[PDB]
Design a protein around this ligand. Structure first.
Ligand SMILES: O=P(O)(O)Oc1cc[n+]([C@@H]2O[C@H](COP(=O)(O)OP(=O)(O)OP(=O)(O)O)[C@@H](O)[C@H]2O)c(O)n1
Ligand SMILES: O=P(O)(O)Oc1cc[n+]([C@@H]2O[C@H](COP(=O)(O)OP(=O)(O)OP(=O)(O)O)[C@@H](O)[C@H]2O)c(O)n1
Ligand SMILES: O=P(O)(O)Oc1cc[n+]([C@@H]2O[C@H](COP(=O)(O)OP(=O)(O)OP(=O)(O)O)[C@@H](O)[C@H]2O)c(O)n1
Ligand SMILES: Nc1ncnc2c1ncn2[C@@H]1O[C@H](COP(=O)(O)OP(=O)(O)O)[C@@H](O)[C@H]1O
Ligand SMILES: Nc1ncnc2c1ncn2[C@@H]1O[C@H](COP(=O)(O)OP(=O)(O)O)[C@@H](O)[C@H]1O
Ligand SMILES: Nc1ncnc2c1ncn2[C@@H]1O[C@H](COP(=O)(O)OP(=O)(O)O)[C@@H](O)[C@H]1O
Ligand SMILES: [Mg+2]
Ligand SMILES: [Mg+2]
Ligand SMILES: [Mg+2]
Ligand SMILES: [Mg+2]
Ligand SMILES: [Mg+2]
Ligand SMILES: [Mg+2]
Lengths: 539, 539, 539
């Protein structure tokens, strides 16, 4: 029955081998999904081996886009998968880093809190990490105690930087015993085309590397481009001393939302539940079956251009692409994304050549970005052509600069992008970096208000430049409306053209893609995809 | 009660760290002693990492003396400790080697028994080793099934040659689970005189090396020259993730027979019994208490010279020294051994300077030996001085050569030591190497028969040269009696002088020290020590 | 080693079948002694099914003598065995009774503490009993937490009164699980002389009765008059579903102090330790071997008369008889007890016929007693004959009455025994019943002080009549000395004659037999037995 006796909090560690980008985080999120559907209170955590105290200092070419929490911490991309699959808001405590651990221990040492002992990597650093892991088990603010804690160990087994985290995980297995701690290992099975064979040796070497630090995997996730033969799974199970139930073939699925089905079909969740002795019930597939219908059987299709610098074959825009697809799901339309380089759109002819075939354009935000002349050029072309545009953060800034160049302000720019501009229509109000959720008020019956169907909203922000209030009355002559603001009205939060000027061209300073979920699409992307559909139908 | 239900055969693996010669084999033998006294049927086994198919090819400077079994196998020194402490005769199967394992697997490959598979170090070699380990568990020829199998892994953790044996032990722990397999780890705690501190770092590194291959020790034997402080044991337990019950301080005992008392006092046997869940009863200390009384509280003392080449600070004569001490124990006399170089006895003045203070001389056997001129010189001096002499193998050969040089045969020698001798009184009957137990018949009322108190005996042999039957009648004029022979009389097995010629001077081709036990002293050494006592008392 | 990790407190329940007086309490005490010698902190408890709130109201024909604790509670006889074998002082909480439990629950009900529930035998009464059982596990006043709690369930399985206690034991086994709770069942194997066969059927029916309430015994103690054959143990093990290791033959030992040896020889303690998974070490038999030497190999012998009413084949004087034998042990003399009826000593000829062969006389205390004319007659005869006398409680009262009748007070008596006496030399100071330990001061160099070798003592008291202070100066003319008193001198605590009047005639109001232990004999009994030995030697 729905009510069960109390049991200790189970720890499930996910680790990676051979390489990064194996979908380790997505596999952990999908397992969290399945365990949630079986009725368990899953909570999740990530451990980042890098020394950056937070990824805000990084460049999106390193590990993709940054993410932001409601308590305002700045965290790795994987916390976004955790949100999108658990449909939850996670604390900043959900992302530990070596930078934070070392800073904490060094500070504690300077204060003498170790009573004159020699501070060492073992026990003190591993103790801090073990403390940070077991803190997840404590009852939440409302007393709800997690049934399973899924911890993802970033990096690769054998990286020098992972050594303290894996030692902490080993000590947790020692303290709590095997009945509470489960190790899931994700590994790569490469295909060599010239000889037409899958090779298990990389997996064997990775499992041996893991054993060399005192960890025995309970299951293996064999990432591959094609379904692994049964003979190879038997060979791997034999060589790696893993139960043949625990070798899980995980081929590249057409979309990330099929992964829960793949793992359920292989009975990974059943294996984990049996091994950890958790109480369970069957998965109610109703919701996710509807989602997968919206994914695989859409009624129509639409093409959207994604314009950026990182677009050169990188997942720097993962949240934006997923929010776009969720918007398509709300309308049961397939959204096809055309990855367009910003710099090909600097010339009007180049912009026409790039964009002429699409049904909409998206200008996402970024940091360390350059060359926004191409972005604004794409805006100018799209407005003339009638394509819908959604601008996120920098997209709104480029929209405002386009409007500035529409009314007389030809040399106008951001102080970020031309410090010598005579018309800094975008300027520092380095100023206060706005981070996290803030409330905003919307113009009644604005296109933004028509989308949200409310006058009050809250959105996650990450930026420090703002619209210069000195130019509102000048740029309003473009027809642009400051249709959403901070509650005091001091800060512009949304801009749009009236529908009769262009059917839909909207920008927002915030990152709404960080509040979207596939089963709860965000209003603005529903609106943007609807406008793109209307363009395609009317064109 | 004495009768208990059936349980699976428990495996206890003993491994070493830091260095060899830590007393790993003696600790295993003492634990076998304690578990036997608690009523369990202990059996024992050794795994030798070296590639020699058997140590017969080695030189006693490498690892000490060789040992011989009743089925006639030639084995490491440690099987001698197993015999002396369990008072048992062990099969040749009790000593596995890498040489045997590789030869077996290669032979099986040549015969195609692996059906075309690639032969690998894993699984095939480790499977052969695991098979050889689990074969010890099978019921004996009488159906007696061992309760515990104690396996000693020779070498050091981290030697390249030990890698297959430790992997086999790990696989045994995997197959049988933790409730059946127990790992005991012996390690060194060095004392640094300049700073006056015991150092635990070598132990930490050894335990880490052991963990790096997938073995977690259940207990630590801390070998030291002085009793380890409690703070250091706590530090070791904390750093090594070992139960504080499992850190066992094992300081250098004055004699090897005190080790069972040291281990019992530390409750190692209790810890092992609890952890393996074995049925037990208290140790009946009656017998071993009597032995230790004979050891520590003797009524008198006697000095015996041990003459050899390996005597330069090496345990090449361990069995001989222990048989001497057992002979002393039968008479409750302390036997003090003066280690005398053979080459200082070549000159009569040098022999007098070396031996003049002793009460008896022992000439042990050997192989690859040279310089027996000094040995025979010691015999000549001792006979003139009246000291008792016992000659083992080569000791008998030197006695016979001395007698040859006593009757006319001044240039007589062994064909081994002067191939050009005109009088090869010792000669090949390379001839048949006699190995193991053979029966012999003794002259009635011979000194040998007076010692054994029987006319028939069996002794372990290891030699290929024999007394040349052509010279019996010539050398008998020395007064020497061929007082023991093979049953057909063809081979001389013992020689002695009549008591009125010298009170006791006896030699035997066999190695009686391989049938002695501390609680069952061998007749000949009882006789030899009694003669030395008589000399000391009469002198 | 001596220091082990923490483990949960183990509960061991001792229950009885077929009949009472099977030595269930003595077996529990012996097991406690063994577990203490193996190094465990044993604590003990008894549950009495009878409704009497304490045994003070009972008659010594029911269950033998009453016992007293230092906090002054009045408890069953078995607490005396627990003291004598553990050599400890136990709280009054060590004796629960149905009277106390029902009174407690009824009182709580009247105060509404059950919040309107229907009060039932299950849960509420069994909950109170389980609470009182688990309270023994709590850390003591110094933080020492017991390792094993041994609980004796009084009565017999299948008595109506035992049903709540056995249900509480079943609930304890449910709560703590089988790894913590062990059931020891004591049962009788009768011998039928006409057919010469031991019968196991009573044991089978008792074990079946026990199983019918949900308890499966882990071991059986087969009480018998002769050693049980092995075939019967096999039959019992098979029929009763008890491990053949757990059927323990426990024949009637010549003295109660052999029982630890019997249980150890049968390996009951080993079985319990293995089954509960307790950490242990071997029993150090030094002390108890010395005790058993004093028991079985005395140098001499002496006969002592025990004069009382309950002497008609009853154990109403167990503590006194054991204290006598402990006194004998201090001197290495065998003490033989001649059980003498008081009423045969009323006439001087009858007293002579009863006592003439003994070497000393003991007058023990009692309650509900009558006919003290015979007791005083034995005192008068013994004093004339010169036999030494020790008088306990009523013995002191009779001594004082004898002295009263020695000086002029022929009609003197206690107000208890002649309410109309004209000379109540013993009188209520019903008055305050003095119970438990009280301090006393002794005359310097008194015979009592010569025994105790001190001027200050404390003794356990149970009485309400006292020496009437009005008669001290009158009765002192007998020669009697009030050689010990309360610190204020108000109360007489010891009386004696000077050695030249009689070599030893002493009485005390207290029960020194309740402070004696077999390994710590009490001064007064050592003195009394020494005086009896001196009489025997001089007579
Ligand atoms: O992705 P997550 O979820 O595991 O989060 C991750 C991924 C990676 N890392 C660390 O960054 C460094 C380089 O990583 P990196 O894999 O990219 O190696 P590289 O030199 O760049 O070779 P390659 O061409 O294969 O990229 C390594 O020290 C990693 O331990 C962290 O801390 N968290
Ligand atoms: O004694 P056991 O019972 O363990 O039986 C033993 C002892 C040693 N071994 C092997 O012989 C080689 C050298 O041994 P070795 O310790 O002597 O090293 P080394 O180079 O000589 O340095 P060191 O000066 O310290 O002697 C090593 O490969 C060992 O694995 C074996 O097979 N059985
Ligand atoms: O003798 P009768 O005249 O009454 O005739 C008897 C005696 C006994 N029985 C039955 O045989 C079984 C074992 O009997 P049994 O008493 O011997 O028990 P057990 O297991 O052997 O224990 P143990 O012998 O030690 O007491 C029982 O089922 C009895 O009901 C019968 O049918 N007739
Ligand atoms: N099983 C899969 N099938 C198809 N695509 C996938 C799968 N797993 C992951 N991906 C994609 O590959 C990328 C790597 O996944 P990711 O979550 O980042 O793992 P990691 O934490 O190691 O970096 C993601 O962008 C994800 O969308
Ligand atoms: N605990 C000890 N105390 C004193 N002497 C010892 C002790 N242990 C071993 N020895 C001696 O040191 C030598 C090494 O012991 P050994 O049995 O050969 O161990 P290993 O198998 O590693 O070679 C032996 O000759 C033994 O007599
Ligand atoms: N195993 C025994 N051998 C000899 N005498 C015994 C034995 N056990 C008990 N007794 C004696 O029998 C009497 C009854 O034993 P007891 O401890 O009181 O059991 P219970 O608690 O049921 O009353 C005791 O006085 C004791 O001295
Ligand atoms: Mg990644
Ligand atoms: Mg990288
Ligand atoms: Mg060695
Ligand atoms: Mg060496
Ligand atoms: Mg009783
Ligand atoms: Mg009764």
């Amino acid at each position: 029955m729905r009510k069960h006796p109390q049991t200790a909090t189970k720890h499930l560690f996910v680790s990676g081998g051979v390489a990064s980008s194996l979908g380790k985080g997505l596999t952990a999120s999908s397992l969290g999904q399945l365990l949630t559907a079986r009725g368990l209170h899953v909570t999740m955590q990530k451990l980042d081996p890098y020394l950056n105290v937070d990824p805000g200092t990084m460049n999106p070419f390193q590990h993709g886009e940054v993410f932001v929490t409601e308590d305002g911490a700045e965290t790795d991309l994987d916390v976004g998968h955790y949100e999108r699959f658990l449909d939850r808001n996670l604390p900043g405590s959900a992302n530990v880093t070596t930078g934070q651990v070392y800073s904490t221990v060094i500070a504690k040492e300077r204060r003498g809190e170790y009573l004159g002992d020699t501070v060492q990597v073992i026990p003190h650093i591993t103790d801090e990490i073990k403390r940070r892991i077991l803190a997840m088990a404590q009852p939440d603010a409302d007393g709800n105690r997690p049934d399973v804690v899924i911890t993802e160990i970033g990096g690769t087994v054998g990286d020098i930087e992972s050594q303290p985290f894996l030692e902490a995980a080993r000590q947790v297995r020692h303290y709590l015993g095997r009945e509470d701690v489960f190790f899931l290992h994700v590994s790569l099975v490469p295909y060599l085309a010239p000889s037409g064979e899958l090779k298990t040796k990389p997996t064997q070497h990775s499992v041996a590397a893991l054993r060399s630090i005192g960890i025995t995997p309970d299951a293996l996730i064999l990432r591959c481009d094609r379904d692994v033969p049964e003979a190879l799974k038997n060979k791997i199970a034999l060589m790696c001393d893993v139960d043949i139930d625990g070798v899980i073939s995980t081929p590249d699925a057409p979309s990330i939302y099929d992964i829960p089905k793949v793992l359920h079909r292989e009975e990974l969740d059943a294996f984990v539940v049996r091994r950890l002795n958790l109480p369970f019930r069957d998965v109610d597939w109703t919701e996710w079956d509807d989602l997968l219908r919206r994914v695989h059987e859409p009624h129509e299709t639409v093409r959207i251009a994604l314009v950026g610098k990182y677009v050169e074959l990188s997942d720097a825009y993962l949240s934006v692409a997923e929010a776009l697809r969720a918007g398509g799901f709300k309308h049961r339309a397939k959204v096809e994304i055309c990855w367009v380089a910003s710099d090909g759109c600097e010339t009007t002819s180049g912009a026409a050549a790039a964009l002429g075939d699409v049904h909409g354009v998206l200008i996402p935000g970024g940091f360390g970005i350059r060359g926004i002349e191409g972005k604004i050029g794409a805006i100018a072309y799209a407005r003339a052509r009638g394509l819908p545009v959604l601008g996120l953060c920098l997209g709104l800034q480029c929209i405002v600069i386009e409007a500035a160049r529409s009314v007389g302000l030809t040399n106008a720019n951001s102080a970020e992008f031309d410090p010598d501009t005579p018309d800094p229509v975008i300027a520092t109000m380095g100023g206060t970096m706005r981070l996290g959720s803030y409330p905003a008020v919307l113009e009644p019956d604005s296109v933004v208000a028509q989308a949200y169907q409310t006058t009050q909203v809250s959105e996650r922000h990450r930026h420090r430049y703002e619209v210069n209030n000195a130019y509102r009355d000048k740029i309003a002559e473009s027809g642009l409306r400051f249709s959403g603001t901070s509650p005091d009205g001091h800060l512009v939060e949304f801009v749009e053209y009236p529908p009769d000027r262009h059917p839909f061209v909207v920008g927002t300073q915030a990152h709404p893609e960080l509040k979207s979920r596939p089963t709860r699409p965000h209003p603005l992307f529903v609106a943007f995809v609807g406008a793109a559909i209307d363009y395609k139908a009317g064109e």
